[PDB]
Design a protein around this ligand. Structure first.
Ligand SMILES: Cc1cc2nc3c(=O)[nH]c(=O)nc-3n(C[C@H](O)[C@H](O)[C@H](O)COP(=O)(O)OP(=O)(O)OC[C@H]3O[C@@H](n4cnc5c(N)ncnc54)[C@H](O)[C@@H]3O)c2cc1C
Length: 392
């Protein structure tokens, strides 16, 4: 028996476990993969940076060789339009295998119990979730929980089991990402050498370059699903990007040497509703995924883990789940909708978006730093333009 059982130990599950422990709750985290393990999504927001400082991890970040992130340089190729989004507060580019392991060790330090295992089923008592089944070695185990937290990322465990809602996928923005790590990439000149670079051409055609260590850079090429299936495996997709997205690519990778195989993965934005219920909740990618063009996923996952523990504590302490879980739900929907709007606005009006950075700018900087979860003008501008556009 535990107060809280967390499925998965990415940024959402790890932060949820840490904050649950800070509220004095007993916590079991079941994670199916042995750490450290590779994972994509390497560029952090200023707000993720602040959580990391709060955990007391800043020195360890520098020690791990994670480059400082000055901001993101966005370059459009069809018109050479270029803009730079400065970082809100100091943050980093990370190798996720090592980063996720660091956060996980902090969770263990706070007294989270970990099991290597794959959660496979929930245990119900009528409508109520009261625990879970998981496989470790050759063997099925049972655990009982007051709240089962699904932090399974894009595995969307509770959705797949029909406990949570079905995925509602955004049909018009379906993309496939292909990526690999390289050495020998030409970096921007200081003070910008370790910025994230985003290159885009047509709508939903884009690429990233992220320095993740002193010598290594992550390259991604992201294109519409149909184009990928039509003209492209992940090697071919990356080559297509090198050829068609921007000349900056062939230039910077002139002397680059790939480390390890390339990979592809769905980049479909989705949302799952409901994502809270009696005895359970979802946090992070387990209920919602946004186009990672602005590198917000880890920041969002961490924030949701933190905010969920608040709700969880109230329920473990005897309050009916509705008021607290619905407050979490509404808080999450509020902030995620702002991110979603920013992204849709960018894809519709990428040039107008950029120029916004010369407009007396501060709001967007804060928003892209992650301040999306707390009167600002920007959210309404994005919302209004998108509604008009859709109506048109
Ligand atoms: C192409 C791409 C690029 C991205 N770039 C960025 C970026 O630059 N910056 C950024 O911040 N975000 C980025 N993201 C998003 C980011 O990767 C995710 O939002 C983030 O990892 C979410 O964290 P999570 O904890 O929710 O899920 P995850 O990090 O995926 O963690 C989930 C964990 O759950 C475990 N698990 C799953 N199912 C089970 C089960 N049944 N039992 C036990 N354990 C289980 C998995 O092993 C996994 O470790 C990107 C995403 C994509 C697709």
């Amino acid at each position: 028996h535990y107060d809280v059982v967390i499925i998965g130990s990415g940024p959402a599950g790890s932060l949820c476990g840490i904050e649950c422990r800070k509220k004095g709750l007993s916590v079991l985290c079941i994670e199916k993969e042995q750490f450290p393990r590779f994972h994509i999504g390497e560029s952090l927001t200023g707000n993720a940076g602040q959580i990391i400082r709060d955990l007391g991890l800043a020195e360890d970040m520098d020690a791990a060789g994670f480059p400082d992130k000055p901001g993101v340089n966005v370059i459009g190729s069809l018109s050479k339009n270029e803009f730079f989004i400065p970082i809100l507060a100091p943050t980093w580019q990370v190798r996720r295998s090592d980063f996720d392991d660091m956060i996980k060790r902090k969770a263990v330090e706070h007294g989270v119990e970990y099991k290597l295992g794959m959660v496979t089923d929930v245990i119900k008592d009528g409508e109520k979730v009261v625990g879970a089944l998981y496989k470790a070695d050759g063997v099925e185990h049972q655990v009982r929980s007051k709240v089962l937290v699904d932090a399974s990322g894009q595995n969307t465990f509770l959705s797949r089991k029909g406990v949570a809602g079905k995925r509602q996928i955004e049909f018009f923005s379906q993309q496939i990402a292909s990526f690999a790590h390289y050495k020998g990439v030409e970096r921007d000149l200081p003070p910008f050498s370790t910025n994230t670079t985003i290159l885009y051409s047509k709508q939903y055609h884009w690429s990233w370059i992220i320095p993740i260590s002193p010598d290594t850079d992550s390259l991604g090429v992201v294109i519409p699903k149909d184009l990928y299936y039509k003209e492209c495996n992940p090697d071919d997709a990356i080559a297509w990007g090198m050829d068609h997205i921007s000349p900056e690519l062939k230039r910077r990778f002139k002397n680059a040497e790939r480390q390890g195989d390339s990979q592809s993965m769905a980049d479909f934005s989705y949302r799952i509703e409901p994502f809270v219920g009696d005895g359970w909740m979802c946090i992070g990618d387990a209920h919602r995924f946004l186009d990672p063009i602005f590198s917000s996923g880890v920041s969002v996952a961490m924030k949701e883990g933190i905010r969920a523990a608040e709700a969880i504590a109230q329920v473990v302490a005897g309050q009916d789940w509705k008021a607290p879980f619905y407050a979490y739900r509404d808080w999450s929907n509020g902030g995620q909708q702002i991110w979603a709007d920013l992204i849709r606005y960018f894809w519709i009006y990428p040039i107008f978006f950029g120029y916004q950075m010369q407009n007396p700018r501060d709001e967007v900087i804060r928003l892209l730093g992650g301040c999306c979860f707390d009167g600002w003008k920007a959210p309404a501008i994005f919302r209004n333009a998108i509604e008009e556009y859709d109506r048109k």
